[PDB]
Design a protein around this ligand. Structure first.
Ligand code: ZN
Ligand code: ZN
Ligand code: ZN
Lengths: 105, 81, 111, 109, 99, 115, 237, 118, 355
RNA sequence: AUGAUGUCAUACUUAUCCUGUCCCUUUUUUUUCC
């Protein structure tokens, strides 16, 4: 997302499987990282919906609870045409916070 | 060093992903030829510019489309080196 | 009307199974269409046939009975003609008809 | 019964400069056979010592016992060595010929 | 430790407030305690701390005293007019250049 | 594919490499018999690396099988196992041998015709 | 609260009571936030002010905000700039009424010494132009683009990335003919820091609207051994 | 998966039971109130019934023992069945001997539901 | 230890030794406050190429070999090794095998985040150092005696093949699987293929035919371990290539169905897992016959005590007797009574997966 | 009318953080016997 530049997206061909977000992350656009005006639905790459990953939070990786949408901006500038936005790197943040957790308590 | 070669990889990959972008050492020739080739695909697209040329010359739209796609191969003369 | 985004050429295979949509360069897609339970129409996810530096003069489906569908697209490959400072490969570069082919078994598209 | 980091390789700090190797061979001698001993030379290594017993058991005995020894108004630092890397090749030639000696020697194969 | 910024704020705060309310003062800077402010001021900051090198006579007195009253630096340091820290390290330094 | 921060070491090495001389005559394998050639390769490498290495052998064989082998890529892929200069050599001696067997009518190389 | 759902709900309730009573009371208290602990936030108060101004139409608040822009304290100037950003993102199409009002503020930010004012002012322009898409307010967007452009040589990632965002927003709102006219002279500059920046911008255009760019390229004279002019475009009928 | 993992299994099972602190009547052993036969596996190819009984008597008396050796060469196949006198003893043996190292070979011990008399 | 004594930097005329000294900022990275950590990390990221690989790794890897490594320290060191890997791009070519010899354990460990880290950084190292380097370097581990390294190698290979795309690496595989010196090589080859399928999943379809050709030659081999592991491979392939690809497996079926009747113990468990996954990929008629055949054997084994026997039959029942093309009362009568008698036991519950 | 380097602290930006989660790590001398 716009906030950790170390993150990556799948960027293969979109498909027909809709994308879902955890209850934790829910309520936002995936890219413009805002919280408003959902216009259109997300679609994800075939691999990025294969396997156990049926119904996972694109971002948080967790349980699918709702649908994932696109802000009015991103759909106006057509940033919504770059295929799977599935993030195929976990990122340092989750790792480090879990590690400090295991240390502390 | 690091800047030059990571931006070089990013520009070579972004270009091989989008035909026709540029990078800090794009030469006049590649710029101009990508710009022709896009003009050509767009004349064949817009159903109408085709009518304009096919009336300006006196050819028929099939022959016009054919000559465009003939030229898209090497439109601005042969390369420069 | 972009260069590498498909839409210009459209082809379908006679027995109705697959449609392919192709750009003028570098991108071709294939969708499969199957009747559902209520026999309403259903569309697959796109397959992919990308191949760099290749114009396409015309695409058309080939008729085969319920076998793998084939699409047979005129072509031409400008990549080397780009690097012929003399101007030869502009001539002596003749266009190659090339039967692509869906592969229902493995679910992809092979030249 | 051994914690498997114990080794016949010991590493020793807080060494009096220009101690006699005689003195030292004695010190570590009450503990077991000394396969070899080396002392640092450069000012950085001058004053530290790698001491190699010929037995893991005298090794552990020593490391556990003389640990914290008072020599020349200072306590002695002992440690187990982490021989975790190498600095030379293994000399295929000599290895191969000594092993040919062994194989023809006991007519194994 | 102390940074020159905290140091300057200390100077000004003291000259305004007088030497007696260290609570208000330490309330001012973050990550500073009233005990520390008091200590630092009397130790280093206050102008009466004479900051020069030791005279020969000063070192005579120091050495002689630290021989007279072993290890009592907060007893000595008033007698030669420096802090316990100055007397301490500087006696260490004389002792090391001797040996 | 996914990342544009790491450089394709294929293109990089293809640029900065020192290749052999005759690796540019295209060669197909349909024009050729192989099991005549193999023992040459077998003994050759067995000499170069001074022992037997089944996986290296089969590596070259499988590299050779497609209708058009890439001599540049096979040069590179061997550079690891061989000395690197021994790579360019072994190429400078094979590739022409394929040229020979491919100009032949039977598909058999000339030195092995004399032999 | 170190959780986010809490802060979220908080802001939404601030909107609700604003509706309950009337914008002025809550807005005055919200503005009294200089709340040093900057992020973890006074930022969420910024969002709250945005929702206030949105739910009861921004007639009311915009004078209060533009007023606060005077209080010489930094974090509160930046507060008003952010709140503007969110304001325009939230209300969307209605900016066609307040853009004339707001500009001379943004002008003032874009022409000052520090990066935080320029980075936050650039966010504003992005959202504003995306909201005014298609309504004919282009002259003022064009003027704001003239102030935005010179930051294009900059280093701190947050400001360089805010600026690039602003530029593509302005692309959809001004057209690409404009951005292309701005981007020409440096495609081939002798420097290389500039040529880097300019080719980055010109790509970000060409990827979008690479079709519109057809009727916009300049006419470039052909030399001896090539032919660079497209004549099919002036076949005269 | 190779059998030492199947020792890991039973030991993890026990410790998990203690971990949840669950009561004995609902302890996984409880499903075999009806068997005094316990399976031994991984025995070295050398142990004979003398040594087996000697060692495993440690929790009671043995009613029967059957050590499957290959009849054609007579040699031990390395696994056996054991009938203790009283279920409780088998519970103890399953707890305590699952994982002991005899002559290097870590033996695995378990209950047996429907022991087949050969 | 060096940091204990002190000496002037000029006197440290071995300016590489000066470099080493200042490099022992590593200690600040290891132990130290968050700000020490951040500043040190920036230091090293940007002075990376200035330092160069040789010193860096020669002074890092001993740490990672420490028996007394805790968790934080470890993940910290992997953080750095990653960042310097992103700066030094080629210079690692001499140091790959070292990097693997240390990273590999992260591939097999109970921590989840440790697995994902180690896997990712091997991907990155594979992308950085060129393929030919990876291949030539970590071949000799295939044959290596100790199984620990054989196993961890197979896993690593699968990762790198994901990074550099299968059709590149395929010929090397084909060589390994049909090696002839010793069978451990073949076993590790087949293991590689298993781990690929497991890892990449549906990215496999276009190569399924080639893979199965590679691997089936072990389905019949007289060695026992190779047969078992091969069957597990086939099952992994199928579970990835769900409904598709059956025309590619057609070549391998009969040996499966041959071995299924007449095997005992282990091979039975494996071959059962394979046919299990295959069944849904089949077509309702072919598959219905095959099904009603297999459910015969299946019934027989509910009462087996062996663990993986029980687990395999669990998953299989799910698939076969959960197919569209079967009937209510058949299941209701012949399957349900034994199923519920045997499988519902408190020992199941206490296990994690079986749950 | 400021260069750089600075283990120089303070400001400041990112609605980033601060709850997410451990499920395919199970790896070896085939070995549950009517
Ligand atoms: Zn968005
Ligand atoms: Zn995807
Ligand atoms: Zn989430």
């Amino acid at each position: 997302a716009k906030h950790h530049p170390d993150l990556i997206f799948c960027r293969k061909q979109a498909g027909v499987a809709i994308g879902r977000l955890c209850e934790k992350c829910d309520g936002k656009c995936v890219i413009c990282d805002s919280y408003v005006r959902p216009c259109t639905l997300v679609r994800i790459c075939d691999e990025c919906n294969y396997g156990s990953y049926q119904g996972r939070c694109v971002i948080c990786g967790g349980p699918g609870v709702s649908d994932a949408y696109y802000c009015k901006e991103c759909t106006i500038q057509e940033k919504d045409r770059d295929g799977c936005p599935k993030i195929v790197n976990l990122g340092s943040s989750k790792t480090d916070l879990f590690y400090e957790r295991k240390k502390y308590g | 060093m690091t800047d030059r070669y990571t931006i070089h990889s990013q520009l070579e990959h972004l270009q091989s992903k989008y035909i026709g972008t540029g990078h800090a050492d794009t030469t006049k020739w590649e710029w101009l030829v990508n710009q022709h080739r896009d003009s050509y695909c767009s004349y064949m697209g817009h159903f109408d510019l085709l009518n304009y040329f096919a009336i300006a010359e006196n050819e028929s739209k099939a022959r016009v489309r054919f000559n465009l796609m003939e030229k898209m191969l090497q439109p601005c003369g042969p390369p420069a080196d | 009307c972009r260069r590498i985004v498909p839409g210009q050429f459209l082809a379908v295979d006679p027995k109705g199974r697959a449609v392919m949509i192709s750009a003028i360069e570098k991108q071709k897609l294939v969708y499969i269409l199957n009747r559902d339970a209520a026999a309403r129409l259903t569309i697959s996810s796109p397959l992919e046939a990308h191949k760099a530096n290749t114009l396409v003069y015309h695409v058309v489906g080939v008729d085969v009975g319920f076998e793998n569908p084939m699409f047979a697209c005129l072509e031409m490959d400008y990549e080397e003609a780009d690097n012929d400072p003399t101007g030869e490969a502009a001539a002596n570069t003749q266009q190659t008809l090339t039967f692509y082919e869906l592969d229902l078994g493995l679910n992809h598209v092979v030249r | 019964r051994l914690p498997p980091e114990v080794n016949r390789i010991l590493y020793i700090r807080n060494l009096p400069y220009k101690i006699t190797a005689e003195e030292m061979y004695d010190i570590f001698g009450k503990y077991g056979p000394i396969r070899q001993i080396r002392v640092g030379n450069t000012p950085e290594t001058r004053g530290t010592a790698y001491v190699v017993y010929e037995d893991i058991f005298d090794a552990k005995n020593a490391c556990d016992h003389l640990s914290g020894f008072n020599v020349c108004n200072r306590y002695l630092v002992v440690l187990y060595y982490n021989a975790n890397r190498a600095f030379q090749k293994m000399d295929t030639k000599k290895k191969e010929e000594q092993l040919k000696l062994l194989k023809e020697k006991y007519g194994i194969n | 430790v102390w940074r020159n910024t905290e140091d300057e704020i200390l100077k000004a705060a003291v000259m305004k407030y007088g030497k007696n309310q260290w609570s208000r003062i330490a309330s001012l800077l973050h990550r500073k305690s009233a005990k520390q402010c008091k200590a630092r001021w009397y130790e280093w900051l206050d102008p009466s701390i004479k900051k020069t090198e030791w005279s020969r006579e000063e070192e005579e007195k120091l050495l002689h005293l630290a021989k007279l009253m072993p290890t009592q630096w907060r007893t000595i340091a008033p007698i030669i007019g420096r802090t316990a820290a100055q007397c301490l390290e500087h006696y260490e330094f004389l002792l090391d250049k001797a040996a | 594919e996914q990342d544009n921060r790491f450089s394709n070491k294929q293109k990089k090495l293809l640029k900065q490499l020192k290749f052999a001389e005759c690796l540019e005559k295209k060669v197909d394998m349909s024009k050729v018999n192989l099991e005549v050639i193999k023992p040459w390769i077998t003994k050759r490498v067995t000499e170069i690396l001074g022992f037997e290495d089944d996986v290296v052998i089969e590596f070259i064989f499988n590299q050779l099988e497609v209708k058009n082998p890439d001599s540049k890529m096979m040069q590179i892929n061997l550079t690891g196992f061989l000395n690197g200069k021994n790579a360019r050599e072994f190429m400078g001696e094979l590739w022409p041998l394929l040229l020979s067997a491919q100009e032949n009518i039977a598909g058999i190389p000339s030195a092995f015709l004399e032999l | 609260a170190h959780k986010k759902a809490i802060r979220r709900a908080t802001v939404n309730t601030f909107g609700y009571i604003a509706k309950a009573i009337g914008p002025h009371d809550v807005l005055a208290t919200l503005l009294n936030n200089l709340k040093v602990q900057e992020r973890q936030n006074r930022v969420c108060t910024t969002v709250a002010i945005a929702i206030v101004a949105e739910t009861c139409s921004p007639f009311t608040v915009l004078p209060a905000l533009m007023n606060e822009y005077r209080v010489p304290e930094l974090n509160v100037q930046n507060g008003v700039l952010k709140s503007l950003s969110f304001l325009f993102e939230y209300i969307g199409e209605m900016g066609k009424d307040y853009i004339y009002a707001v500009t001379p503020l943004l002008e003032d930010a874009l022409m000052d010494r520090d990066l935080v004012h320029r980075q936050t002012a650039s966010a504003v322009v992005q959202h504003m132009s995306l909201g005014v898409y298609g309504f004919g307010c282009e002259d003022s967007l064009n003027h704001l683009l003239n102030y935005v452009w010179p930051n294009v040589f900059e280093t701190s990632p947050h400001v360089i990335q805010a600026v690039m965002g602003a530029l593509e927003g302005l692309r959809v709102a001004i057209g690409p003919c404009r951005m292309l006219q701005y981007c020409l002279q440096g495609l081939f500059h002798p420097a290389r820091k500039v040529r880097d920046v300019y080719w980055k911008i010109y790509n970000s255009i060409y990827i979008g609207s690479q079709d519109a760019l057809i009727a916009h390229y300049p006419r470039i004279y052909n030399d001896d051994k090539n032919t660079y002019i497209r004549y099919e475009l002036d076949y005269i009928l | 998966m190779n059998p030492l993992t199947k020792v890991k299994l039973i030991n993890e099972l026990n410790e998990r039971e203690v971990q949840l602190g669950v009561a004995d009547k609902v302890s996984w052993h409880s499903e075999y109130k009806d068997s005094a036969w316990i399976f031994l596996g991984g025995l070295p190819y050398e142990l004979t019934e003398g040594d087996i009984i000697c060692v495993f008597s440690q929790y009671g008396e043995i009613v029967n023992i059957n050590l499957v050796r290959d009849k054609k060469t007579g040699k031990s196949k390395g696994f056996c069945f054991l009938c203790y006198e009283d279920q409780r003893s088998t519970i103890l043996a399953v707890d305590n001997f699952n994982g002991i190292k005899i002559k290097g070979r870590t033996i695995r011990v378990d209950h047996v539901s429907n022991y087949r008399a050969p | 230890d060096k940091l204990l004594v002190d000496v002037d930097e000029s006197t440290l005329s071995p300016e590489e030794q000066k470099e080493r000294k200042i490099m022992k900022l590593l200690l600040k990275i290891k132990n130290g406050t968050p700000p020490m950590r951040k500043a040190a990390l920036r230091q090293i990221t940007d002075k990376a190429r200035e330092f160069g690989a040789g010193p860096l790794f020669n002074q890092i890897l001993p740490l990672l070999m420490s028996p007394t490594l805790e968790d934080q320290e470890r993940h910290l060191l992997v953080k750095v090794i990653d960042r310097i890997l992103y700066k030094l791009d080629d210079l690692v070519r001499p140091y790959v095998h070292k990097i693997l010899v240390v990273i590999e354990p992260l591939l097999i460990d109970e921590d989840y985040y440790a697995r994902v880290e180690g896997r990712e950084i091997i991907s990155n190292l594979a992308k950085a150092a060129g393929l030919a380097t990876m291949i030539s370097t970590m071949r000799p581990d295939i044959d290596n005696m100790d199984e620990y390294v054989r196993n961890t190698t197979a896993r690593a290979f699968a990762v790198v093949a994901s990074a550099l795309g299968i059709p590149s690496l395929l010929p090397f595989l084909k060589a390994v699987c049909k090696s002839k010196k010793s069978w451990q090589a073949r076993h590790t080859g087949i293991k590689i293929v298993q781990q690929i399928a497991i890892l990449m999943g549906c990215a496999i379809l276009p190569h399924l035919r080639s893979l199965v050709e590679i691997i089936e030659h072990g389905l019949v081999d007289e060695q026992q371990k190779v047969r078992t592991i091969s069957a597990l491979a086939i099952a992994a392939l199928a579970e990835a290539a769900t409904p598709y690809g059956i025309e590619s497996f057609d070549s391998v079926l009969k040996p499966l169905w041959k071995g299924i009747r007449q095997h005992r113990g282990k091979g039975l468990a494996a071959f059962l897992k394979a046919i299990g996954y295959l069944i849904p990929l089949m077509d309702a008629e072919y598959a219905n016959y095959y099904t009603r055949e297999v459910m015969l054997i299946l019934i027989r084994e509910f009462q087996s005590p062996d663990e993986e026997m029980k687990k395999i039959v669990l998953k299989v029942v799910k698939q076969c007797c959960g197919t569209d093309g079967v009937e209510a009362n058949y299941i209701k009568t012949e399957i349900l009574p034994p199923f519920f008698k045997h499988f519902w036991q408190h020992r199941m519950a206490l296990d994690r997966r079986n749950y």
